[PDB]
Curated annotation (Swiss-Prot), chains A, B:
Binds 1 Mg(2+) ion per subunit. SUPFAM superfamilies: Thiamin phosphate synthase. Its EC number is 2.5.1.3. InterPro entries: Aldolase_TIM, ThiamineP_synth_sf, ThiamineP_synth_TenI, TMP_synthase. It comes from Pyrococcus furiosus (strain ATCC 43587 / DSM 3638 / JCM 8422 / Vc1). Belongs to the thiamine-phosphate synthase family. CDD domains: TMP_TenI. This is Thiamine-phosphate synthase. 2-[(2R,5Z)-2-carboxy-4-methylthiazol-5(2H)-ylidene]ethyl phosphate binds at G157, I177, S178.
Amino acid sequence: NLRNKLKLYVITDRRLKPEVESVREALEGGATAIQMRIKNAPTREMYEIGKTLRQLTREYDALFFVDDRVDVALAVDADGVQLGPEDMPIEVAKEIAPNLIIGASVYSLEEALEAEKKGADYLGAGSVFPTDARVIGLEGLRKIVESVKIPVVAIGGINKDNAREVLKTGVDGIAVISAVMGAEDVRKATEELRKIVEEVLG
Amino acid sequence: NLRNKLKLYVITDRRLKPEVESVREALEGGATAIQMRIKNAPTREMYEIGKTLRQLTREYDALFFVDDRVDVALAVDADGVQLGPEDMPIEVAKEIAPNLIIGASVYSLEEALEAEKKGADYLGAGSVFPTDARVIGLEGLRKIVESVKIPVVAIGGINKDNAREVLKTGVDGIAVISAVMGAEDVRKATEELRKIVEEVLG
Ligand code: NI
């Protein structure tokens, strides 16, 4: 279910590659979850791209999340929304969007446990490595994993050279941006990471 | 109902004045509707300000709208959302937020008729005068008024000097930004406009 489909979590970055093409390649390569993350674009544009990503993810039986924007997630029938300290409070998103899966970006053990208490469905725990400027490291990531019962996706500076050490901490998934989106060959970059995920998680 | 509460429609602009302070003064001055219009702030901030303006508007029995953001409108229990060409499509907004009043920003007769057809509850028809920079003029405003059955609020370049001529096109209300938010005394500017509105519309 959710826990399994969070294993390889790929986030868009139009600074690096256009969303639709890059998501297609990531999905070809074995991404199990996609997050649309668009910093500054009109709502209509977010909606149109979101509709396309919702179709592609469905074609590959992948989960689809939108960063921040609950309106957009609702409008495109996304599986969920990712929420951080500058976003809609968890309890409020839950009220207005009771069927969305809520991911919470957390940067400390206190924040992890609080997000879980407020009803987050999974955590994005970071930043594991330098990339909020807070860096939790492998040690901090491991402590969050040990303390919470909801799924935990590691994030922050994760790539093929460190993915194994990250996955050894007990997380359910890794989230990547640059490692995939900034690659010369997006699909191959994703395949390399998915192999490591399969190797460590089983 | 809606039609009577659209008569003096005041829109925020933090480029001129902060929202909470200025909305209090406009409500004191007789604004009947307030629209929160914030560019480039975090969702958390939009939510916090929205909650305050929701409370304020209720205290003065004024309607409360949010520009663009259906998520924010839902989260703060606003009365409605205003939607333009770069925003969520009307039909989609109605699907995800079936209890919100929908205002449509329209800049032509075709846009007016299409928005009404799609189920807009009222129109923001403009720009009447120079202040999306499209200008429709008094004749274009009148034509819209003659052609649609839903309430029409005029917008764009409106002030105490041209407000009567605008009101004589048959609109249900006037929307102002600079005339009130750019005034030295926000309350007094709003009082003046409200009087003009009451005197023409009766
Ligand atoms: Ni390909």
